[PDB]
């Protein structure tokens, strides 16, 4: 079971250091700006990251939401990503979760973070290029270990 | 062609009842292995009708439940590449079937990107 | 659990260029905004327009709006162009992998 610890404003930017954002159709997008322009661009580029207590440590369980004009939470369920209008719920039940992750530094590359899906292990959100656009998915990554697994979460209060 | 987010199937097929059967669907452009493929069977003239789904990664099959046991779908993971089998064919086989991908962050649960279509006739 | 049925109506609509079409469906339960629509040209395979019942896909042109929950949805094509006519279906995902179509419908020239 999980509960809510806190909750965090935070930028989530990709290997390449394009910042994730959500827009009008829930269709999560990376970009390159900086720090001041993803505070401008809000609430489309600030992630409420909840961090949760899990009866059993794999380590550090997170939620990932955003403010539209509503809250819509990021969501792995049938290891497709969508973000499902709702708040992310103060106590969770199961050892497992569509929209709990995993956060987890990357071994031997310094700040790096990595997300792991509760509901599918060795599932991680990844970053892959729709031939111009990155874009955020969920790929088994324990074999491939692929560099776009790797994400930085930046403090925004 | 290329690098553009495509799912190429295979040829026109002409057979005779009875004949078994396997069409494929190859996918190009993007993590093949992470998206779910569906099977749409279209009879000349008629409507779009969902046959299954498989995830090409580790081949985890979902199908229609009008087309559980009729059909049988799979995948090779390093080929990219999905398929839909018959044992026995029916003239009743006769139609249009198309594959296509499902969404996933981007027009999620939806078929946003579909290959061509494979035309199967099953005649004697 | 049995299937959800998508009922679009009419099954033909004759609409003339410049003028408004309004397509409709109907879900047989509450499908919330899980809804898609898509247009299918002949001797073509359909392609996404509109997906969680009001937002269009790629490149899909502003004339074309999508509206609806629950149980009744449509869709709206103003100003119809020469490219518009075609056959649209309707798809409920309310609980994928559990999907069904509508049977479609046609949008042809009037003159």
């Known amino acids: 079971y999980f509960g809510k610890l806190e909750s965090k404003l935070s930028v989530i930017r990709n290997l390449n250091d394009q910042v994730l954002f959500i827009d009008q159709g829930n269709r999560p997008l990376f970009e390159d700006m900086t720090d001041s322009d993803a505070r401008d661009n809000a609430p489309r580029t600030i992630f409420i990251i909840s961090m949760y207590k899990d009866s059993q440590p794999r380590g550090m369980a997170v939620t990932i939401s955003v403010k539209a004009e509503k809250i819509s939470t990021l969501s792995a369920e049938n290891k497709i990503i969508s973000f499902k209008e709702m708040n992310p719920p103060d106590n969770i039940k199961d050892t497992k979760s569509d929209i709990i992750f995993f956060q987890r530094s990357v071994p031997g590359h310094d700040n790096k973070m990595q997300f792991e899906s509760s509901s599918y292990e060795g599932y991680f959100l990844a970053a892959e290029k729709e031939r111009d656009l990155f874009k955020l998915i969920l790929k088994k990554e324990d074999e491939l270990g692929d560099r776009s697994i790797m994400f930085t979460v930046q403090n925004e209060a | 062609k290329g690098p553009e987010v495509q799912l190429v199937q295979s040829g026109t097929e002409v057979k005779k009842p009875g004949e078994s059967l396997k069409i494929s669907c190859k996918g190009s452009?993007?993590?093949?292995?992470?998206?779910?493929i569906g099977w749409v069977r279209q009879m000349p003239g008629k409507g779009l009708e969902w046959m299954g789904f498989?995830?090409?990664?580790?081949?985890?099959?979902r199908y229609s439940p009008t087309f559980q046991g009729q059909v049988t779908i799979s995948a090779d993971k390093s080929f990219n590449t999905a398929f839909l089998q018959w044992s026995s064919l029916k003239a009743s086989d006769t139609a249009m079937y198309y594959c296509?991908?499902?969404?996933?962050?981007?027009?999620?649960?939806?078929?946003?990107?579909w290959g061509q279509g494979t035309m199967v006739t099953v005649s004697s | 659990a049995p299937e959800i049925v998508m009922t679009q109506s009419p099954a033909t609509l004759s609409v003339s260029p410049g003028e408004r079409a309004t397509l409709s469906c109907r879900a047989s339960?509450?499908?919330?905004?899980?809804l898609a629509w898509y247009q299918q040209k002949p001797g073509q395979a359909p392609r996404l327009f509109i997906y969680?019942?009001?937002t269009r896909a790629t490149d899909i042109p502003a004339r074309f709006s999508g509206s609806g929950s629950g149980t009744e949805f449509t869709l709206t094509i103003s100003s119809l162009q020469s490219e518009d006519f075609a056959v649209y279906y309707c798809?409920?995902?309310?609980?994928?992998?559990?999907?069904?179509f509508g049977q479609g419908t046609r949008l042809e020239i009037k003159r």
């Open positions: 498989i995830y090409p990664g580790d081949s985890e099959t």
């Open positions: 798809q409920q995902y309310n609980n994928w992998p559990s999907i069904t």
């Open positions: 339960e509450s499908i919330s905004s899980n």
């Open positions: 296509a991908r499902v969404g996933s962050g981007w027009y999620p649960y939806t078929f946003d990107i």
């Open positions: 969680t019942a009001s």
């Open positions: 452009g993007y993590t093949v292995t992470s998206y779910w």
